[PDB]
Structure formats: C-alpha cells, structure tokens
Amino acid sequence: STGSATTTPIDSLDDAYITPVQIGTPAQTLNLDFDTGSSDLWVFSSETTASEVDGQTIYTPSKSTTAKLLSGATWSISYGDGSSSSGDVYTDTVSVGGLTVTGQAVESAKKVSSSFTEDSTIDGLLGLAFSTLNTVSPTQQKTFFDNAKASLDSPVFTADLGYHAPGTYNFGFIDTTAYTGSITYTAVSTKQGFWEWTSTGYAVGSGTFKSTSIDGIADTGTTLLYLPATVVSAYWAQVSGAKSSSSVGGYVFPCSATLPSFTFGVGSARIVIPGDYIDFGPISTGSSSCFGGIQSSAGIGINIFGDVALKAAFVVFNGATTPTLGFASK
CATH class of the missing domain: 2.40.70.10 (Acid Proteases)
Known part of the structure; x- marks a missing residue:
C-alpha cells in the first residue's frame, strides 16, 4: 500500500504545516501537524475542556462506529516549546492520503496548553518519531507509520515541505x-x-x-x-x-x-x-x-x-x- 497527502502552511510565515487526516467511521477529517520529533497522535476532541477549544475541529469518538476506548490508558506530553496536552485513548481507523490503519491509538485531549488553544488551525499532532517516545501509559502505543509499515510497498515516508506553498507527505514510496x-x-x-x-x-x-x-x-x-x-x-x-x-x-x-x-x-x-x-x-x-x-x-x-x-x-x-x-x- 501507499498514501499521499498534501500538507499546507498554516499562515504566511510557514509557522507549521497541516495535513488532513480521516479518523473513525464515518470519517471525521481533522487537520493535524505531522511531527517527526514526537510519537503521539493526539487530537482535540469532544472530551477537551470547553474553555480550551477555540475554533479547532474536534474528534467525537461516540460518533464513530469503529472507536473503542483503550481502557485504562492515559497520555501526557510536553514539547520543547513548553506546550503540553494530556488525556485518554481510543483505538480507531485512521487514514492519511488513502493509506488506512485499523486499531490506531488516537489520543483524545482532555487538556491542552494555551498555545494549542490559541492556534485554531491545528486540530492535533501526528507523531512520526520512533514509537519508543510514545507517552501512552501503562501500555505504550505505536505511531501511525509503525502500524502501517508492514503493509507499505517500501518502509519509508517522505517530507516535501513547501516554501510559502503546499507540499506533500508520501507513505510507502519515493x-x-x-x-x-x-x-x-x-x-x-x-x-x-x-x-x-x-x-x-x-x-x-x-x-x-x-x-x-x-x-x-x-x-x-x-x-x-x-x-x-x-x-x-x-x-x-x-x-x-x-x-x-x-x-x-x-x-x-x-x-x-x-x-x-x-x-x-x-x-x-x-x-x-x-x-x-x-x-x-x-x-x-x-x-x-x-x-x-x-x-x-x-x-x-x-x-x-x-x-x-x-x-x-x-x-x-x-x-x-x-x-x-x-x-x-x-
């Protein structure tokens, strides 16, 4: 298999890039920040503290027929810029650019720090570092890439970011x-x-x-x-x-x-x-x-x-x- 998705700068400075990701059944499309420096796929959700949501699109697991609570699992992450988020965990079907993983851990935010709230364009993160950094406890979870790898034509992904322009993330081919x-x-x-x-x-x-x-x-x-x-x-x-x-x-x-x-x-x-x-x-x-x-x-x-x-x-x-x-x- 392969996938291919366009990634788009969030603003005129290329401060970050967002890529649409389909989560659940029927699909809920959220725009996620693909992050090769972390290993958690987390989303704004129906569980996020209401005062901490300001324009983001949310994942509602109760509306997904394929969502399942990962019982007992929690997560909590702090990033190098001082931002943070935490919550609980569902498994669900996640697709990027036509590539589908079933049983992906989708980390639902209960709390996000102010910088996330203040950025209405980023609905969550999709981590692409190694799964050893994943913060889910007590059972660490695999990244989207780790879960997809065995199915991919080649065990690779590529980042082709644009300067003041959209670019592409590809999975499974060069x-x-x-x-x-x-x-x-x-x-x-x-x-x-x-x-x-x-x-x-x-x-x-x-x-x-x-x-x-x-x-x-x-x-x-x-x-x-x-x-x-x-x-x-x-x-x-x-x-x-x-x-x-x-x-x-x-x-x-x-x-x-x-x-x-x-x-x-x-x-x-x-x-x-x-x-x-x-x-x-x-x-x-x-x-x-x-x-x-x-x-x-x-x-x-x-x-x-x-x-x-x-x-x-x-x-x-x-x-x-x-x-x-x-x-x-x-």
Whole structure:
C-alpha cells in the first residue's frame, strides 16, 4: 500500500504545516501537524475542556462506529516549546492520503496548553518519531507509520515541505519526480527516539564550506533551524545590524536586509537554504525588526533541523530495520 497527502502552511510565515487526516467511521477529517520529533497522535476532541477549544475541529469518538476506548490508558506530553496536552485513548481507523490503519491509538485531549488553544488551525499532532517516545501509559502505543509499515510497498515516508506553498507527505514510496539529482542517505541514531543524524558542515552565503560534524534531529514539528551558537553567530555576522536580543528571544535583523543563504552538508552533498527562507517577518506588527529563522540551540540540548532546513530538501525517512535519512535538492 501507499498514501499521499498534501500538507499546507498554516499562515504566511510557514509557522507549521497541516495535513488532513480521516479518523473513525464515518470519517471525521481533522487537520493535524505531522511531527517527526514526537510519537503521539493526539487530537482535540469532544472530551477537551470547553474553555480550551477555540475554533479547532474536534474528534467525537461516540460518533464513530469503529472507536473503542483503550481502557485504562492515559497520555501526557510536553514539547520543547513548553506546550503540553494530556488525556485518554481510543483505538480507531485512521487514514492519511488513502493509506488506512485499523486499531490506531488516537489520543483524545482532555487538556491542552494555551498555545494549542490559541492556534485554531491545528486540530492535533501526528507523531512520526520512533514509537519508543510514545507517552501512552501503562501500555505504550505505536505511531501511525509503525502500524502501517508492514503493509507499505517500501518502509519509508517522505517530507516535501513547501516554501510559502503546499507540499506533500508520501507513505510507502519515493516519488522520483519530486526532486533533482540524487538522494544522499546518511546514518540515523534512534537512541533518543528521534531521526537523529550528523551533518558534515555548513557554509554561509557564497562563503567556503566548513567541515564539522553537527549532530541534530530532522524535526518537521519545529519551525526554525536551531544550531550551535558558533554556527549561528557566523551566519548573522553576515547581516548588517543583526543581533541577538534577550528580550525578543533570539536573533533579529533589520527588515530592510537581504539575507544570505545557508548551506548544510549531508555526507558529500549540500542542501542550500535560500536567504528568503530565513526571514520570519516583523517581531510585532509594524516593526522594522524581523525575526531570524536560524537560532541558537544552546540551552535546548539538541540541534534541530526544523522546517527552515527541511523545506529546502526532499527528505526520506527510511524506516528499514536499520533506519536512515535521505536528502535531495528539489
């Protein structure tokens, strides 16, 4: 089997991407944030505290003839941005882009933190990291990809995120028309439950490539590119007037600037992030200070190849017995 679904930016900055997902019988379609940095499929639901729902579409398990309470199971998750959610668990039929899994754990939110409530466009998350990170207790549950894997033509999914445009998530096949050149594959460590890999270095603009190992995670659920402070300082030093602002929470730059590109290494290959992809716009409406898309990972404890980096590439998440990551230009 295979599946193919379009993923759409939630706003003009590509702050996140939503993908329609069919849950239950008859289908209830919710727009979920596919997140390769976590491993829970959770949804706003008829059980969510009413004051914490503000425009999201909800899953109502009582209206699904295939929903079954997973008796005794609870879940609770906290994300790197400080957001959180928790609740109970149903199993139900879940389909993405024509690919169907029966008996998928659908984690129904009883509580969500304010940032989820305040984002009316995201109806939940669909985790695509390794199932060892799934938070369901006392019986840990498998991700949608883990459940589908054995049925897929090939045990892979791909992320093809757009810059200020829709893109595609495919399951079970590699669309050879979706990228240019060849795909360069690189080793993955699953020890932390992430799609963790080691970049071979970086360049700023037209500058020379610096060969240096950068361990980080491929995370579609993180907006920006978070790298070591040395790398990030080298980038922003090429932008007149750019500075790190403790009050704003990272590097800002004059909105009048033209940003240089940023290149990252994948083995001997190179992925170029155009300068425009690094512009996240005014810090507040009407400001001439703009927020940077490359930020320091210092204090986060891990480097994160988020959407800013991933949208510059066609990315293969290879879930073979020994997982690997592939990157191609596009």
